[PDB]
Every structure is written in structure tokens, then in C-alpha cells.
Design a protein around this ligand. Sequence first.
Ligand SMILES: Cc1cc2nc3c(=O)[nH]c(=O)nc-3n(C[C@H](O)[C@H](O)[C@H](O)COP(=O)(O)O)c2cc1C
Ligand SMILES: Cc1cc2nc3c(=O)[nH]c(=O)nc-3n(C[C@H](O)[C@H](O)[C@H](O)COP(=O)(O)O)c2cc1C
Ligand SMILES: Nc1ncnc2c1ncn2[C@@H]1O[C@H](COP(=O)(O)OP(=O)(O)OP(=O)(O)O)[C@@H](O)[C@H]1O
Ligand SMILES: Nc1ncnc2c1ncn2[C@@H]1O[C@H](COP(=O)(O)OP(=O)(O)OP(=O)(O)O)[C@@H](O)[C@H]1O
Ligand SMILES: [Mg+2]
Ligand SMILES: [Mg+2]
Ligand SMILES: [Mg+2]
Ligand SMILES: [Mg+2]
Lengths: 330, 330
Amino acid sequence: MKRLTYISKFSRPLSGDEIEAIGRISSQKNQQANVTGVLLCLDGIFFQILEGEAEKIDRIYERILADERHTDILCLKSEVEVQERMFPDWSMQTINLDENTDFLIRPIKVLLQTLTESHRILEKYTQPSIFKIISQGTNPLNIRPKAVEKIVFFSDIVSFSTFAEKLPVEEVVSVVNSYFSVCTAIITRQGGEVTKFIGDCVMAYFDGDCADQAIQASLDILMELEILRNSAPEGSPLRVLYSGIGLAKGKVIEGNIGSELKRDYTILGDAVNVAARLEALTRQLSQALVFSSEVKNSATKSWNFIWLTDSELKGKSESIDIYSIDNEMT
Amino acid sequence: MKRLTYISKFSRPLSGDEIEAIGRISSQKNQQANVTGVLLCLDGIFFQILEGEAEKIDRIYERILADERHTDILCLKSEVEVQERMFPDWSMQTINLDENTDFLIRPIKVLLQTLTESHRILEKYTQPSIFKIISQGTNPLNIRPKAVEKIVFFSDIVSFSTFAEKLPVEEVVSVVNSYFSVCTAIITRQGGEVTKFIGDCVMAYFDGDCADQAIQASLDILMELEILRNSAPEGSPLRVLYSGIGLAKGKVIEGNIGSELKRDYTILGDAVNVAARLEALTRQLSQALVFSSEVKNSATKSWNFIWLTDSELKGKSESIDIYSIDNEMT
Ligand SMILES: Cc1cc2nc3c(=O)[nH]c(=O)nc-3n(C[C@H](O)[C@H](O)[C@H](O)COP(=O)(O)O)c2cc1C
Ligand SMILES: Cc1cc2nc3c(=O)[nH]c(=O)nc-3n(C[C@H](O)[C@H](O)[C@H](O)COP(=O)(O)O)c2cc1C
Ligand SMILES: Nc1ncnc2c1ncn2[C@@H]1O[C@H](COP(=O)(O)OP(=O)(O)OP(=O)(O)O)[C@@H](O)[C@H]1O
Ligand SMILES: Nc1ncnc2c1ncn2[C@@H]1O[C@H](COP(=O)(O)OP(=O)(O)OP(=O)(O)O)[C@@H](O)[C@H]1O
Ligand SMILES: [Mg+2]
Ligand SMILES: [Mg+2]
Ligand SMILES: [Mg+2]
Ligand SMILES: [Mg+2]
């Protein structure tokens, strides 16, 4: 048995009648799927618990994400191997807390709103990776550090200083946020984890045996930015949004890093400086993407590799072979 | 009138009897101070609402922080200028939800635990500055970017690469976390805001007219690390924990930066690269602290300034006068 808890936001103002309609249909369909649960709403926020056979639940849940009347769905907990039903009497018990006024529910419905309002804000400042760990019943703070091989991704906007010196504050942030949004969307799509933003820089990493997906994310980013530049409106600052990209491979420490007040779940190691160094080299070369031979050697597909003879790196241990992809972009 | 909501963790296992004892005494003292509220507990978590005259509330609250039976106090909301009492009938109404079993409270007490467990984890990955903004009724995501003068603080561990190459993974993280903890404690104490950890680096900033407090935090850090090195156990890696420090002043953008999935409330601008550049210069000089003349010119106290003739900076616009403090440390 699987039990699923989640929360969402009202996509549009719903009346107490529309909510009841959802509960009724939900009750009918859950009655036949041998599913039980409870649906609660409070000042434009939905809360639902859903329990039953994992297969049947997976079906119902993915259909709930299709529902237009709510958005910002976030699953707080996914229990597997459950043996007991929390609410074996209710196929769907709807509880509109906005109308309930029992004196004992009053202190609890206030705290619930306060805790939820705060939670939904912390989400935006939190990495989506932590939420997945929490949902699985693992406390990410209790994770012990470990050494692991990763592909480190570094990309940095070209000559961002001029933007700040010639554009209003609102437009600079708009340019950098658009860039971060494009990078994050493609990296996450290829399995990458965006760990840190460093000024106008994106820091990310891939599994150590995923060099093909790091190269493909890099290439797709460069393609997306070229379409972005050519399709931007007239006089838009996005027309001159260029980036470099550097990829390196190496053994890094992954784990909780920081102080008692704040910490990050990120990586640490030499491969970070190499990736950063390589990204910087793109300013000198015509190629916007450069990577080490350990990345090139870890790829499984037959990329159009080009061997670059500009390995003037500093701070490393020995010589490093530099590579790029020879295509219309680079 | 002021209404105060907060949550805390049981410092030790409390029985339902000890809790009732807290409520009773709380009721007696709140009855005379014209104070009303509600105290709720759930699986080792306290929740309390407190409302009344701001002065009387401030007194009660600071005494509650003195109570040893709970810890990790975090105020979720501080309403000021309140006109209505939420619970005008209860000086202190205690509700032990662990024992309550009303069928209607059951779905709500589960969600409450799930939301709280998650919240308390997100706190550790969240900057304490966001929580203060949320408590005041301001949504930090709706804050618009602005240009502002700041003193940027940069400090970086000296030769951290050797630590990773010669110590087990657990001890490296222990060394960097101890360093981050020392830096954060002193910076926060002097009014500074620690915004980002960049590998073995601490990035922080001060108000633009607080150069004296940035210099004093820097000096105190260097003193703390010297005591840490001399007092460490035998063969401890903390004996060789050294840091550099760079301070710069300039106009930076402050605001929400990132993508739709994750964003940071941080700064951006040239002063960041200058502070980072200055910190790096300490590797060449005997002084562990260096700062620009704009920092030196913004100080109000009569520091023992020393004018450094090593302004070989790169990437800047023009020459930059370098300064340090001449004392037993540097
Ligand atoms: C917050 C929210 C919760 C919902 N929960 C359920 C549920 O638990 N079970 C269910 O069968 N449908 C649920 N639905 C509705 C489904 O998304 C979908 O509309 C329904 O299954 C399709 O109904 P139909 O059989 O008439 O096509 C929910 C919708 C919303 C907005
Ligand atoms: C979660 C928790 C909540 C408390 N809430 C209150 C309160 O609302 N009002 C109050 O007067 N004391 C409250 N106290 C107790 C005070 O911290 C303190 O012990 C008490 O005011 C001192 O009692 P005394 O007058 O016998 O010295 C609380 C203690 C704990 C652990
Ligand atoms: N060492 C650093 N550590 C952290 N953040 C930095 C550092 N240097 C710069 N930044 C941040 O990055 C922003 C852009 O600096 P950057 O070095 O990328 O310049 P640029 O004008 O974009 O040129 P380039 O083409 O060399 O990248 C700076 O305003 C600052 O916010
Ligand atoms: N450009 C960079 N951007 C972000 N993080 C970096 C960068 N370079 C290094 N790091 C991180 O910082 C860690 C330490 O690198 P760093 O350059 O500080 O070397 P170090 O051995 O501590 O020497 P130093 O005395 O020069 O500081 C690296 O392992 C990596 O985790
Ligand atoms: Mg740049
Ligand atoms: Mg940069
Ligand atoms: Mg270092
Ligand atoms: Mg460093």
C-alpha cells in the first residue's frame, strides 16, 4: 500500500460549491478503486491524503496533476510499504476549513495557515532536490558526506558588468534571471542538478558516468540562447546575452556544508576549479564550450570532437588536454 | 496590541503532566497581565499564540526563551497594531494533541505534523534573514531589486586543497564547517549578513556606512582562528587553519536572483569581484586582511592603518589604494 500527502494552490477562486463537487466525484471514483483519503482546503490551499494500492494511487495522482483548478503541487511525503489505512472509512472526506468554526479547530486552523504560508515561501528559496529527499522519509540533514565522481558544469555570462553599468536595476535582474531560467530548465531535463548561483554564473553537476548528457545540455543551452537572441524584441538587452561553458570530471565531496545557522547540500573538490578555469578560457577562444579529456573520454556517443591546443591552465597539477565540439555554434 | 506566534522543540521528553503544569502556571501569570493565548503540542513540538499589550508580551516572550524545557524557538509571525483578540476567553488554553483523538481532528493533526517536520528541515537550509522578513508580514519574494551601497566581505581558507587530499571525507567537512561556524558567528554579531558559501569561501556584506564593524569582525575572526589553532588537540587539522580576508565598498544590486525553481536573496555588482581579488592578494603579502581605500575612508574610528604598495590588481578600472591594519596579527 502507498500513502501520498501533497498540497497545492487554488488556480482560481473556487466556491464552496465547486469544492464539494470535486469531493463528490472524488468519492465516487475512489469508492471503486478501493482508495481512501481526505481533502482539506484553507484560504486557497488544498491538502489531500491518498492511500491504497500503489498502482491505483499512481494513476489517480497523475490525473490530479492534470486538473486545471489547482497548481503548485508539491508532494510532502510518499510512504511505501504501508500496512494500515489511516482513514479506512472515507473514500474522500472533504473538509472545507474556511467555513468550519468549531472553537477547538480555531487555534489549529490558524497555525496551519501560518505554517503553510511560510512553507510555500521557503520552497522558492529551496532546491527541488531537498524536497524529494524529504518526501521519501529521509532527513537530508542526517546524510553523511561522501567522495563521489561527478561532472561539474560551469557557465558564465559574457561581459555582464556592462549590463549593470548601462541598464536600470530591474532590467539587469530580468536578464540574469532569464539566463538562469534557461540554463536550469535544460540541465534539469538532462538529469543535472543546479547547486549554486555565483553572481552571473551557474554551477551544476552530473553523475560521473553521464558525460553525454552534460555535453548535450551544454549544446542545447547554446542553441536556446541563439534562438533567444535572434527572436528578442527590438532594442532588447537579450540580443547580446552570450555565455561560456566549462565541463570537468573528478572526485568531489558531496554533503551538507555550512554553519549551524545555514548550510547547503552541495559538492566540493578540485574538479570545481577546473571547470571554472575551463569556462574562463572560452573568452580567449572562438568556442563557447570547452571540457577536459576526462569528460571526452567518458562520453559514449560519437560526438564531433575537436582537440584544442590551448592548455595554458594555471593552478592545476599537470597538463590538461582541452576539447570542444565542432559545429555551427562553436 | 501585539500578537506573537512561534514554534519550538521539546528540549527533553515531557509528560502530559509537565505540560499541564506549564499551562496552569502560564494561565495564572497571563490572567494578571491581561494576556491571552493558546498552547499546542504535537509529537515533541510546541506551538503558541500570544496576544496583548506589546510591552507585556515582550516581557513574557523573552522569559519564555529562558525556559530550558524547549529549544529551537523560531517566531513565525509578529503582528503589531492588532485591534482584535483572537482568543479573548483564554489566558492560556493548553491543547495536547498527542492525546486528542476526535475523528475530525485526526486528518488535521497529521498534516500539521507533516508540514512542521518539513518546515523545520527547510529552516536549516534557509538564511535567518528571510525568516525575519516573513515574520514581519512581508513576503520576501515580492521585494523589488534596488541598487545600494554595501561593504562586501570575502574570506577564504588558505590551501584547502591539501586538506581534501590528505584527510578522510568526514574530517575535511568538519574543518570547513568549523571555519564557517566561526566566521558566521562573528559577522552576524557585528551586523553583517552572510549571503553565500562558495566552496571554502564565506561571502558576506555590511551596510555601506558600517566600515568600522566590518574591520572589527575581520580582526576578531583572525583572533578567533589564532586561539583555535593554539588550543586544538594534538595532531588536529585545525592547527593549520588559516584564512585570508578582503573587504571592498561599492554600489551593488540587492534582490531576488535565480530561476523559477530556486532563487537567492543576495547582492550583485563590481564590489564583489574587488573584494574577492583583494582576499586573493593576501596569499602574496604577510597581512591576512586587506581592504580598499573606500573602506578605509568610510571608517570613523582611528584604526592603526598601514598603506600597502601592492596594488597590482587585474580586471579593475583604474588604480586602487590597498590598506590593512598593522597589529600583532597581520
Ligand atoms: C485538489 C483536487 C483534488 C482532487 N482529488 C481527486 C481524488 O482523490 N480522486 C479522484 O478520482 N479525482 C480527484 N480530483 C479530480 C481529478 O483531477 C479529475 O478531475 C477526475 O478524476 C476526473 O473526473 P471524470 O471521471 O468525470 O473525468 C481532484 C481535483 C482537484 C482540483
Ligand atoms: C512552551 C513553553 C511555553 C510557555 N508559555 C508561557 C506563557 O504563555 N505565559 C507565562 O507566563 N509563562 C510561560 N512559560 C513559562 C515561562 O517560561 C516561565 O517558566 C514562567 O513564566 C516562570 O514561572 P514563575 O513565575 O513560577 O517563576 C512557558 C514555558 C514553556 C516551556
Ligand atoms: N570571485 C567572485 N566570486 C563570486 N562572485 C563573483 C566573483 N567575481 C565576480 N562575481 C560576481 O559575478 C558578477 C559578474 O562578474 P564577472 O567576472 O563574470 O564579469 P563579466 O562582466 O560578466 O565578464 P566575463 O565575460 O569575464 O564573465 C560580478 O558582478 C559579481 O556579482
Ligand atoms: N572558481 C571557483 N568557483 C567556485 N568554487 C570554487 C572555485 N575555485 C575553487 N572553488 C572551490 O573552492 C575549493 C577550494 O579552492 P581554492 O581556490 O580556495 O584553493 P585552496 O587550496 O584553498 O587555496 P588558496 O590558498 O588559493 O585559497 C575548491 O575545492 C572548490 O570547491
Ligand atoms: Mg560573467
Ligand atoms: Mg562570474
Ligand atoms: Mg582556499
Ligand atoms: Mg576558494
